[PDB]
């Protein structure tokens, strides 16, 4: 007849006898090295812990007191990690850069929430007195995703009667805090201390039968400022290659006009910016408005309500304006040009219509409808670039009140040339293995594949060389040919052409190339790793 | 050469010959006999149904007519289930409490939507005439997740030659309805009837080769009111232990000032509350406002617009106010205190700025911008706690119009001390196996692990003892040592300290402990379950 | 003692030696169909392509210039695909209708995002001058989900020594564009060209050991307009049967009063509609308003603010109305009836409260609070139905300004009788296998099971015959008994009764029945498929 596979019953296999346990450890804190950077060390050695995985680092955030504006960057927990390294008596087993750990967890909304993504943390709070509480104390949790979590117990790190050391290097606190001038960052930085604790799932296993494993170790290279090339040397067995860009704000004071806070949509960034500009853009004054630079060009709105700024027509109509007063428009709030009587980037020209009602009670304008063409790039321009030496105009024609509200943003994990990484600034990408073109593209097809294959909406241009199921199989890799000089991956990009009279032209770019090398994990006489060659 | 595993082709195995079928059954309804609670009984007896799984219970909701405010709780279908039991001739095979079924499906957005989560059902509707329709008839669907759905046909319940009985126990209709005093709940409760139907996926199988299986049966223990301990006895082979708290509103009339309806975000709860208070908070009156208790302290807003309530400064500026009228501020709308010389919890002090415009056409204030520090706890205070014997003040200084709009909320599945379970009220947790400490924590590390391992945002403090793949392996369990007295799990919490002058300090709490025991399923003389023991 | 399976270690198997590669191809464009329909042709054959899967089609959308309102339908990429077929020398291997491909990807948010779902694309933009840019050029990506992606390399299509041809048939551009009369669609349609490119993951495999496979091929039948029956013939081995309805707008000009754009919630549809009606519903005029048809009944709002339209009372109160002017209410904005002095469907009766403030500066009413009972069906009524011959009334008593803003919507993938498919129009469903009733239901239990089993919130009434794991097992199917005449699936529905004096009654319906037949894939003398019988 016919031999059939039973799809209604199963012979329940008896597994290895084990007992899991959640373990938490306090570490050893050290302020040694460059600018006395914080390093936490956690030593795991126990006769009963046979294997482990699922590392979670918790951080105690202090009470923030005083005057000024202060808020934490979104996912504050991931952003204060600089480097993570797992090692034994035989040396490093696995290690990752903070930004690469963050990139691996970006598709895990739970891990991101736990690390600190809330109104309480991420909104920009204000202290009114020196004894006022800006932020209340809080605990954040950072999931340190490792290759040991992939297939739970099967993929766990076995401790071959060895001592495992987890070392966490922290970023300066300046990187995770959004603040204004008024805030006393100097004494905050002096008083701040990283208070960490490491948790992991430990397994007490009876009669383990250890076998060798394979692990992928991410390695990254950052190019020279504004160079559209980068190279990864000694590439012998890679499972994937990822490419992205980062802005470099070293030529600026890292001050930006606005920040949306906990609301992180592209619309939220734009709305926060427009709201800051509208304070100085439309003025209801008796005579001509006062307290603006001499270079400012504030014009009385005509009876038809249209103000012409060259080619741009701005329609301004404000209701209930008192008889003794008039409506004025700032026609050059933020200006940029590299040549006199030539092209100009004027933010006031990005407004089509402004409508509202004047409040006799609060003596201010309440804006109803605003038609504009402000984008995520405009909100991402550092205030330094508006007032650069290249600019023939004064640039920043805002009030001193507005300039005082500007924020310092030093988020370490920004990509592209805008806060949302919306703008694609790569026109073409070429990857070479030796001198042979391995891959090229004129569109982000590699990012599209990344997002589809990993079911993430925050992908990067990625080349995958391994489609083989993890843990149960030895991974598939791009393999070197040293004799033919094929022992390196060279990435070359063509950046999209930008307007010289737009301030973003002057945001410095850095090309980031991430390579995942294959390693063999051997548990013969303690845990050891070997680079596949 | 190298022996290689084919990763590009597979030998497609021929499975068991079977035919699936969706089956629907009407039951037998019974209101016998404690508080005359509704019980629906469904008998599956067919010579051709070899196995089954994926139980879906449907409920016909009636047309709600009359006057008053009425709405259904979110996920109405799950909230009306008290208990579910599956039985054989040999007894119960599997059973679960309503709240535990809900907790297992809480991360299934599809199952939750199907159960009743819409603007049509969950918004608080109002009836203006006795013949007015408040709610239209509707059907909701409840996915009764069982261990038999885990691996589809492999995990299905085999009927063999036995008769399967599914029994559903329902909660009072009072638990699933949000209403005001105006609504005639008395005749609604009299006339309401649960109209259920059970659906399941049945499999007609040719030449079944049945083998024994393992099943996890959740068992829960609720502690005494305000007891920070609970114990699960006869723990011999458990796969997990879960711990959470529930509020107990028995010391209250279950009335709350506001409810957001279908909009269930923390911001939605806060916005609904602020909106209710603003009606009495800022008044545009000719002379001093009337219709408030003598204990109300309503003050005329000065020319600078700032009203000082002790340390708190409230900025009130209303545009287009008529010349014959003035702007007033209610400085003690809600106020709590246990001494006449102590700290006062005043809700009017939680406001920094209130701005708007008076409408000459509709004779009302239209609020534009409001700066406040109202949180989810404030929206979760029962009105009874504001007017408790512990409070030396009158407490509720609102108008009779506002007090008439208060809602009765009896949702059976609330956790913590707020409607969103945002506030973590446990400071420490200790789990003991016998008298030996098995696990302790001073932070919700076990909840963080629960949320990460189950990829969920609605976790609980959970200890998992099983990391082994389900169905294909016998589960891993915490095992008893009866001689050493290690055959019980004792949970002890330490609740976080709250200010005695905050009304939320008087919310009664109950500790819930859920334990998943391992059972062996045998199909010799029909279906039978055996508790795994030494 | 006891035999235990190792749950902590695995012998990492060495897989087949292969190298993946992302390949992109330009096709051959052809306008050779009935109405000169666009066909793209892609030919795949190579030494180093042994297998392939994960088909992604990219489309270059042009810059849209000129005057008028224009926007793209949501998920424009999927909506422009009419049919897809994969074939070899031996004929077709797999093929799908555009709507069925879309239905399979509807639960993949990433795939839907990539296909064109943004405010930039889907919001209705306006061109003010003939040289004005309405839409900027853009690239969208369409994931052509095939049975070959299910289990990655294991399920991949092997090419053998065969040439694979991927044929894409496109819908008219008319189907993917939302526009008004002002827009010059005539020259847009003339100038528009589909610019496609096919990408796939190709595998260079060393020493392939090919084995036969099984594939499910979806096949659909569309019933006659308004016929509550449809039959699928030659059903021998089906894995599932799906049933849904579609509106037919052939009896209309495909014009609708409003469209929400990027915002696609039921509330967004209703809000966009109310906003369009309010322009003509409440008028602030000196004397009786002008520029409305003689059939319009515009009434001055009394001192109490209540206007009675038969049984319906509408409360209207507008602030800051000038002394020389009064507030008017349009009591029959849109009205329908099949007889004089009988039942009437009047849109003005669906309002109970309208409040706002008149703006002296912009000479318009700014509405604050609106109480109404407008639903998703009202927003889904084609304007043709309001002004049909069946209507004894004029029907559309709006202003010429409002009528000029009406939009053409030809979205090919609409289900039910409303844009959100909210309203269930099927009261009963009966499925017959031969002349024997296989399944019947009076509620959408089969849709509930579909949504639960496939973890989707956009399911259909579906009968699943296969619960067996894919690729590793031969699928389970409903099997024919040709001698007993049991080789066909007949579907019969009962539609819910609709009011003859409601315009939606006149929306025509079509029954869609989808059947997934089982086929064997064999690789002897090239790639070839055989229907299981």
Tell whether B205 is within 8 A of chain C (Cβ).
no
User: Does B300 lie in the same domain as B418?
Assistant: no
CA distance C504 to C510: 15
Cβ within 8 Å, pair C467-B20: yes
Find chain C residues with C-beta within 8 A of B21's C-beta.
439
Residue A85: asked if its preceding bond is cis (omega within 30°), the reply is no
User: Does B168 lie in the same domain as B284?
Assistant: no
Breaks after residues in chain C, judged by C–N over 2.5 Å: none
Tell whether A8 is within 8 A of chain C (Cβ).
no
**Helix H or strand E segment including C384:** helix C383-386
Q: How many pairs of residues across B and C have Cβ atoms under 8 Å apart?
A: 130
Cβ within 8 Å, pair C22-A446: yes
Q: Count of H helices and E strands in chain A? A: 9, 36
Question: What is the SS3 assignment for C441?
Answer: strand
Tell whether A468 is within 8 A of chain B (Cβ).
yes
C498 and C507 in contact (C-beta within 8 Å)?
no
Other beta carbons within 10 Å of A346: 20
The domain containing residue C197 runs over which residues?
1-246+414-533
User: Does A343 lie in the same domain as A285?
Assistant: yes
User: Does A267 lie in the same domain as A171?
Assistant: no
Tell whether A441 is within 8 A of chain C (Cβ).
yes
**Nearest one of C360, C369, C76, B370 to A318, comparing CA atoms:** C360
In terms of Cβ atoms closer than 10 Å to its own Cβ (0-12, 13-18, 19+), residue A355 is buried
CA distance C299 to C277: 16
**Nearest one of B294, B290, B312, B314 to B304, comparing CA atoms:** B314
Find chain B residues with C-beta within 8 A of C436's C-beta.
none
Q: Count of H helices and E strands in chain B? A: 9, 36
A215 and A168 in contact (C-beta within 8 Å)?
no
B342 CA: distance to closest CA in chain A (Å): 22
C461 and C204 in contact (C-beta within 8 Å)?
no
Interface test mutation site (partner A, options C12, C25, C128, C455, max chain A beta carbons within 10 A): C12
A69 and A256 in contact (C-beta within 8 Å)?
no
Cβ within 8 Å, pair B449-A113: no
For B528, what's the count of Cα atoms within 13 Å in the CB-facing half-sphere?
A: 9
C93 and C521 in contact (C-beta within 8 Å)?
yes
Cβ within 8 Å, pair C8-A464: no
A488 and A234 in contact (C-beta within 8 Å)?
yes
CA distance C333 to C257: 12
- DSSP secondary structure letters along A289-350: --SS-TT--EEE--TT-EEEETTEEEEEEEES--TT-EEEEETTSBEE-SSTTS--EEGGGG
Tell whether A129 is within 8 A of chain B (Cβ).
no
CA distance A80 to A171: 5
> How many structural domains does chain B have?
2
Beta partners for A84? A96, A168
**Where are the extended beta strands (E) located within B151-257?**
157-158, 164-170, 177-179, 196-205, 213-222, 229-233, 237-248, 255-256
DSSP code at position C486: B
CA distance B307 to B281: 12
Q: What is the resolution of this structure in A?
A: 2.8
B326-330 sheet: strands from edge to edge: B282-285, B326-330, B298-300
CA distance C191 to C177: 14
User: Does A371 lie in the same domain as A231?
Assistant: no
> For residue C163, what are the CA distances in angstroms to A246, C23, C45, C90?
43, 15, 5, 10
Q: Cβ neighbours of residue B497 under 8 Å, at least 6 residues apart? A: none
Question: What is the SS3 assignment for A36?
Answer: helix
Cβ within 8 Å, pair B443-A8: no
Q: Which residues of C90-123 are buried (b: 16+ CB within 10 A; e: fewer)?
A: eeebbebbbbbbbbbbbbbebbbebbbbeeebbb
- DSSP secondary structure letters along C7-71: SS----B-B--EEEEEEEEE-EEEE-SSS--EEEEEEE--TT-SEEEEEEEEEEEPPEESSEEEE
Q: Cβ neighbours of residue A265 under 8 Å, at least 6 residues apart? A: none
A396 and A387 in contact (C-beta within 8 Å)?
yes
C501 and C343 in contact (C-beta within 8 Å)?
yes
Cβ within 8 Å, pair A208-C359: no
Tell whether C7 is within 8 A of chain A (Cβ).
yes
- DSSP secondary structure letters along B418-463: STT--S--EEEEEEEETTEEEEEESSSHHHHHHHHHTT-SS--EEE
Angle at B281 between CA B277 and CA B287, to 5 degrees: 145
Cβ within 8 Å, pair C54-A210: no
Instruction: Identify the closest residue of chain B to C317 by CA–CA distance.
Output: B361
Tell whether B161 is within 8 A of chain C (Cβ).
no
CA distance C181 to B494: 70
Tell whether C495 is within 8 A of chain B (Cβ).
no
Beta partners for A86? A94, A166
User: Does A213 lie in the same domain as A109?
Assistant: yes
A457 CA: distance to closest CA in chain C (Å): 6
Chains touching C (3+ CB pairs < 8 Å): A, B
Task: Report the DSSP pairing between strands B196-205 and B51-61.
Answer: antiparallel
Which residue in the set A5, A16, A472 is minimally distant from C13, CB to CB?
A: A472
B125-127 sheet: strands from edge to edge: B125-127, B68-72, B177-179, B407-408, B255-256
- Of C413, C442, C471, which marks where a domain is finished? C413
Chains touching A (3+ CB pairs < 8 Å): B, C
> For residue B164, what are the CA distances in angstroms to B59, B93, B198?
21, 9, 13
User: Does A148 lie in the same domain as A37?
Assistant: yes
CA distance C154 to A78: 37
User: Does A460 lie in the same domain as A384?
Assistant: no
CA distance B532 to B466: 15
Sign, Cα dihedral of A241, A247, A250, A256: negative
Tell whether B371 is within 8 A of chain A (Cβ).
no
- Of B393, B413, B433, which marks where a domain is finished? B413
A172 and A34 in contact (C-beta within 8 Å)?
no
Cβ within 8 Å, pair C211-B10: yes
Q: Cβ neighbours of residue C81 under 8 Å, at least 6 residues apart? A: C57, C98, C101, C102, C142, C168, C169, C170, C171
Task: Report the DSSP pairing between strands A81-88 and B426-433.
Answer: unpaired
A461 and A426 in contact (C-beta within 8 Å)?
yes
User: Does B385 lie in the same domain as B342?
Assistant: yes
A315 and A306 in contact (C-beta within 8 Å)?
yes
User: Does A319 lie in the same domain as A232?
Assistant: no
Tell whether A318 is within 8 A of chain C (Cβ).
yes
A426-433 sheet: strands from edge to edge: A229-233, A488-495, A426-433, A436-441
Other beta carbons within 10 Å of A2: 5
For B75, what's the count of Cα atoms within 13 Å in the CB-facing half-sphere?
A: 23
Which residue in the set A14, A467, A476 is minimally distant from C2, CB to CB?
A: A14
Task: Report the DSSP pairing between strands A351-359 and A312-319.
Answer: parallel
Tell whether B187 is within 8 A of chain C (Cβ).
no
Cβ within 8 Å, pair A305-C361: yes
Chains touching B (3+ CB pairs < 8 Å): A, C
Find chain A residues with C-beta within 8 A of C109's C-beta.
457
- DSSP secondary structure letters along A410-440: --TT--TTSTT--S--EEEEEEEETTEEEEE
B489 and B206 in contact (C-beta within 8 Å)?
no
**Nearest one of B403, B311, B313 to B354, comparing CA atoms:** B313
CA distance C155 to C52: 9
Tell whether C441 is within 8 A of chain B (Cβ).
yes
C8 CA: distance to closest CA in chain A (Å): 4
Which residue in the set A7, A208, A453 is minimally distant from C8, CB to CB?
A: A208
In this structure, what are the phi and psi dihedrals at residue C154, rounded to the nearest 5 degrees?
A: -60, -35
User: Does C258 lie in the same domain as C224?
Assistant: no
Which residue in the set C355, C443, C472 is minimally distant from B13, CB to CB?
A: C472
What is the 3-state composition of chain B as percent helix, strand, coil, each rounded to the nearest 5? 15, 40, 45
Find chain C residues with C-beta within 8 A of A448's C-beta.
56, 114, 141
Other beta carbons within 10 Å of A86: 24
User: Does C154 lie in the same domain as C97?
Assistant: yes
Q: How far is CA B526 from the centre of its chain?
A: 37
- Of C375, C394, C413, which marks where a domain is finished? C413
Instruction: Identify the closest residue of chain C to B153 by CA–CA distance.
Output: C467
B159 and B52 in contact (C-beta within 8 Å)?
yes
Tell whether A89 is within 8 A of chain C (Cβ).
no
B32 CA: distance to closest CA in chain C (Å): 30
B72 and B122 in contact (C-beta within 8 Å)?
yes
């Amino acid at each position: 007849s016919i031999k059939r596979s039973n799809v209604f019953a199963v012979d329940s296999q008896i597994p290895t006898l084990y007992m899991p346990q959640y373990i938490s450890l306090s570490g050893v804190m050290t302020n040694d090295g460059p600018d006395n950077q914080a390093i936490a060390s956690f030593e795991i050695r126990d006769q009963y812990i046979t294997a482990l995985n699922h590392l979670v680092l918790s951080l105690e955030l202090p009470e923030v007191k005083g005057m000024g504006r202060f808020g934490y960057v979104p996912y504050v927990g991931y952003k204060c990690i600089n480097h993570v390294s797992i090692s034994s008596c035989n040396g490093v087993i696995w290690e990752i850069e903070g930004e690469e750990l963050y990139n691996n967890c970006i598709n895990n909304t739970i891990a991101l929430k736990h690390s600190g993504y809330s109104s309480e943390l991420n909104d920009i709070s204000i202290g009114l007195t020196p004894n006022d509480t800006i932020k209340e104390p809080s605990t954040v949790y950072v999931y340190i995703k490792t290759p040991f979590d992939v297939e739970d117990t099967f993929s766990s790190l076995k401790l071959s009667d060895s001592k495992i050391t987890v070392t966490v290097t922290f970023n300066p606190v300046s990187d995770i805090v959004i603040r204004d001038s008024s805030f006393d960052f100097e004494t905050f930085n002096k008083e701040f201390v990283y208070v960490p604790e490491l948790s992991f799932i430990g397994y007490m296993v009876k009669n383990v039968q250890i076998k060798p494993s394979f692990i992928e170790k991410p390695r990254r290279v950052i190019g020279q400022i504004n160079q559209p090339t980068a190279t990864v040397t000694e590439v012998h067995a890679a499972t994937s290659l990822s490419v992205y860009t980062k802005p470099y704000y070293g030529n600026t004071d890292n001050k930006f006009i606005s920040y949306p806070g906990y609301s992180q949509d592209e619309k939220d960034y734009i709305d926060a910016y427009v709201s800051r500009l509208l304070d100085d853009l439309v003025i209801v004054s008796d005579g001509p408005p006062t307290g603006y630079p001499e270079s400012a060009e504030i014009v009385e709105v005509p009876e038809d309500g249209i103000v012409s700024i060259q080619d741009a027509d701005v329609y301004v109509k404000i209701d209930n304006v008192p008889d003794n007063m008039s409506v004025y428009l700032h026609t050059n709030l933020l200006m940029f040009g590299t040549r006199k009587n030539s092209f100009i980037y004027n933010i006031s020209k990005k407004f089509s219509a402004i409508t509202g009602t004047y409040s006799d009670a609060t003596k201010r304008t309440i804006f109803a409808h605003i038609s504009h063409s402000i984008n995520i790039i405009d909100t991402s321009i550092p205030v330094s670039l508006w007032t650069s030496q290249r600019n023939v105009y004064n640039g920043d024609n805002r009030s001193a009140e507005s300039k005082a509200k500007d924020l310092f943003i030093n988020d370490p994990f920004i990509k592209g040339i805008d806060f949302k990484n919306k703008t694609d600034i790569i026109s073409r990408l070429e990857v070479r293995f030796g001198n042979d073109v391995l891959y090229s593209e004129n569109g982000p097809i590699s990012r599209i594949y990344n997002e589809l294959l990993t079911k993430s909406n925050n992908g990067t241009r990625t080349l995958t060389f391994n489609f083989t199921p993890k843990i149960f199989f030895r991974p598939t890799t791009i393999t070197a040919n040293v004799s033919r000089g094929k022992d390196k991956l060279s990435v070359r990009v063509v950046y999209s052409t930008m307007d010289v009279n737009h301030p973003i032209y002057y945001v410095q770019k850095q090309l980031v190339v991430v390579c995942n090398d294959l390693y063999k994990v051997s548990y013969d006489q303690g845990v050891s790793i070997t680079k596949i060659m």
